[PDB]
Amino acid sequence: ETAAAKFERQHMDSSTSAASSSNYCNQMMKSRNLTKDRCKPVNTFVHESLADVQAVCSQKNVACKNGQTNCYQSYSTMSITDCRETGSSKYPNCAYKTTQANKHIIVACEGNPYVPVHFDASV
Numbered sequence: 001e002t003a004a005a006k007f008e009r010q011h012m013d014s015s016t017s018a019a020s021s022s023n024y025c026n027q028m029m030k031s032r033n034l035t036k037d038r039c040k041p042v043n044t045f046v047h048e049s050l051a052d053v054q055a056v057c058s059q060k061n062v063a064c065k066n067g068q069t070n071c072y073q074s075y076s077t078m079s080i081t082d083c084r085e086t087g088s089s090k091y092p093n094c095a096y097k098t099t100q101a102n103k104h105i106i107v108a109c110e111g112n113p114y115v116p117v118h119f120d121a122s123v
């Protein structure tokens with residue numbers, strides 16, 4: 001999988017404007033194949049058009065939590081859903097807590113074309 005495609009598969013959900021129910025994370029973590037060989041412990045889905053997320057690579061340049069300087073913060077807030085494993089959860093019965101919010105996203109960009117390859121954080 002290319003870096004751009006992996007980002008898309010793990011973080012884009014443009015078909016809904018916001019986390020539906022408390023079971024959104026259980027459904028999405030499984031359908032995007034993030035529960036396949038293990039339970040991905042934390043994952044954030046973004047509910048905006050791909051174009052709008054790709055446009056962040058030309059917005060505010062900031063440092064990544066890792067120290068690199070190819071991170072960018074979205075000027076505006078975006079609809080996101082944080083998916084986190086609950087203290088109970090254990091493979092292969094992955095269980096997730098769903099938290100819907102509107103925050104600025106931070107992503108790492110790379111390549112040509114220059115697009116998002118990593119979800120750094122939200123604020």
Ligand SMILES: *CC(=O)NCCNc1cccc2c(S(=O)(=O)O)cccc12
Nearest residue numbers: 006007010011064066108117118119120
């Ligand atoms: C959620 C997501 O953004 N997936 C892409 C795969 N994970 C990933 C890609 C690139 C970097 C990276 C880092 S790093 O610290 O910059 O090296 C850490 C965890 C996951 C990724």
Ligand SMILES: [Cl-]
Nearest residue numbers: 002003004005
């Ligand atoms: Cl690609």
Ligand SMILES: [Cl-]
Nearest residue numbers: 009031032033
């Ligand atoms: Cl897949």
Ligand SMILES: [Cl-]
Nearest residue numbers: 042043044119
């Ligand atoms: Cl994430």
